[PDB]
Amino acid sequence: QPMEEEEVETFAFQAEIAQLMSLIINTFYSNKEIFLRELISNSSDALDKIRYESLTDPSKLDSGKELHINLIPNKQDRTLTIVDTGIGMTKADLINNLGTIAKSGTKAFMEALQAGADISMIGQFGVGFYSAYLVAEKVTVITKHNDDEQYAWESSAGGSFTVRTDTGEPMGRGTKVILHLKEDQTEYLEERRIKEIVKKHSQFIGYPITLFVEKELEHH
Amino acid sequence: DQPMEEEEVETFAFQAEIAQLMSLIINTFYSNKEIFLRELISNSSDALDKIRYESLTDPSKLDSGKELHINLIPNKQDRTLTIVDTGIGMTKADLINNLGTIAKSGTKAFMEALQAGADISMIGQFGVGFYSAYLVAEKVTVITKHNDDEQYAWESSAGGSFTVRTDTGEPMGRGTKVILHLKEDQTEYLEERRIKEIVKKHSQFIGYPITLFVEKELEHHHH
Numbered sequence A: 001q002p003m004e005e006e007e008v009e010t011f012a013f014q015a016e017i018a019q020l021m022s023l024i025i026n027t028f029y030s031n032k033e034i035f036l037r038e039l040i041s042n043s044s045d046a047l048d049k050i051r052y053e054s055l056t057d058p059s060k061l062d063s064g065k066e067l068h069i070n071l072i073p074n075k076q077d078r079t080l081t082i083v084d085t086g087i088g089m090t091k092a093d094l095i096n097n098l099g100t101i102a103k104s105g106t107k108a109f110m111e112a113l114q115a116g117a118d119i120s121m122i123g124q125f126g127v128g129f130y131s132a133y134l135v136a137e138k139v140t141v142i143t144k145h146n147d148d149e150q151y152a153w154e155s156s157a158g159g160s161f162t163v164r165t166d167t168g169e170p171m172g173r174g175t176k177v178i179l180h181l182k183e184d185q186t187e188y189l190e191e192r193r194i195k196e197i198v199k200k201h202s203q204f205i206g207y208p209i210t211l212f213v214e215k216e217l218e219h220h
Numbered sequence B: 001d002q003p004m005e006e007e008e009v010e011t012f013a014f015q016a017e018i019a020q021l022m023s024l025i026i027n028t029f030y031s032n033k034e035i036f037l038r039e040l041i042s043n044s045s046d047a048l049d050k051i052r053y054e055s056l057t058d059p060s061k062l063d064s065g066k067e068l069h070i071n072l073i074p075n076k077q078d079r080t081l082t083i084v085d086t087g088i089g090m091t092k093a094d095l096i097n098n099l100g101t102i103a104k105s106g107t108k109a110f111m112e113a114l115q116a117g118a119d120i121s122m123i124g125q126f127g128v129g130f131y132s133a134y135l136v137a138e139k140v141t142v143i144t145k146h147n148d149d150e151q152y153a154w155e156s157s158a159g160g161s162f163t164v165r166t167d168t169g170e171p172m173g174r175g176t177k178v179i180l181h182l183k184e185d186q187t188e189y190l191e192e193r194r195i196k197e198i199v200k201k202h203s204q205f206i207g208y209p210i211t212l213f214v215e216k217e218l219e220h221h222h223h
């Protein structure tokens, strides 16, 4: 008689990816703010892909025409959420894209960090998503692709991640990254901080970026 | 070559007394216009109760979203205040029947109590609370989505008529979204501090999460 029941799948990260996450999540780095640049850049890439699909098949935008990125800090939850209405990811995409298949750059980037490369270059090796763990103890990715159901990926590192169908609020289409911030990284929940980081690092992104400051009202 | 969309747009006349009530609401001063938010939050709470009670005996009714809540979104750039809930929503007929074509006994007497000069606050008791929206809004748009039906848009600028159409905007899972296009001298209801105090004052007993999202477009990234 449960309110609900669903299957949860747990997957091991590919060895190199686990190594990178441990390196990122544990090691001191001076400008972690670049995490937000990498996630906005990923969102922009997703919006490009749906935009170009719609040019040959407009019905692809039946799930929503607006192409944009929302940034949603929630001090009460200590979460920062980046939402886009891009092309989204199938379940296979989540499992493949986000853990089980290490690409050249995974090892290549740890290879480069030894060679004197910087962490802000994590994006040039195509593994920018993982910079999220510079500031987050846990990351949840919720995604909805056309013709597919809405899935939720999550990891606190430690070598594994889970995937399940998301029963939360339905998205029309796109991807939402929920960063559950480390205790000492709450600065990234502040309007002034988010504003300056976007102005500094994401000036060239070609889609609306909008802030929604979230506050749960007292007693509610 | 081909249109993106093609749809019928229907225009309805407001029932006579409803039209009369709206004109009174728009053209009369009241010292406590803030009660409009109480009325719309109350309507959302009712819608939420209904999908919850339905879900008891029929659990699959929450397939369109499990979370039951109310969001308030002020957008200073657009001068809109939006109230969104994940309640049971309205079918096209519910929308037409509820929002303007049928008048109840509680209209002619209330609308006459205001012509007589009563306190606008009593509007909710007479079951016409939605129309308090026009205390602060020059136009109201309602987007609604009921299980097993299409998403519809209702809209009126209170000229004696309103329109209904299938909506082609951003998809809602389920529920109702009220978009208030605010009057120029009623923009205070876009302010965070103002919204907080109104909710704290009038909606203390609403048994659902009410969440404010202060919308701010970022420099060089508008639209």
Ligand SMILES: O=C(c1cc(Cl)c(O)cc1O)N1CCC[C@@H]1c1ccc(CN2CCC(F)(F)C2)cc1
Binding pocket: A039, A042, A043, A044, A045, A046, A047, A049, A084, A086, A087, A088, A089, A097, A098, A126, A127, A128, A129, A130, A143, A174, A175, A177
């Ligand atoms: O839905 C998303 C998406 C993904 C993330 Cl993570 C996001 O923050 C926002 C998004 O909209 N897509 C769909 C197609 C393009 C975009 C995407 C998909 C995969 C990568 C590669 N990275 C994934 C982990 C990695 F190993 F670091 C390498 C980048 C962008």
Ligand SMILES: O=C(c1cc(Cl)c(O)cc1O)N1CCC[C@@H]1c1ccc(CN2CCC(F)(F)C2)cc1
Binding pocket: B039, B040, B041, B043, B044, B045, B046, B047, B048, B050, B085, B087, B088, B089, B090, B098, B099, B100, B127, B128, B129, B130, B131, B144, B175, B176, B178
């Ligand atoms: O979708 C909604 C809903 C409607 C409005 Cl307006 C809202 O602000 C939020 C909502 O969720 N429903 C579904 C069922 C219960 C709820 C509802 C429906 C009708 C009335 C009566 N009013 C309609 C005009 C009136 F004449 F003033 C009397 C109240 C609540």
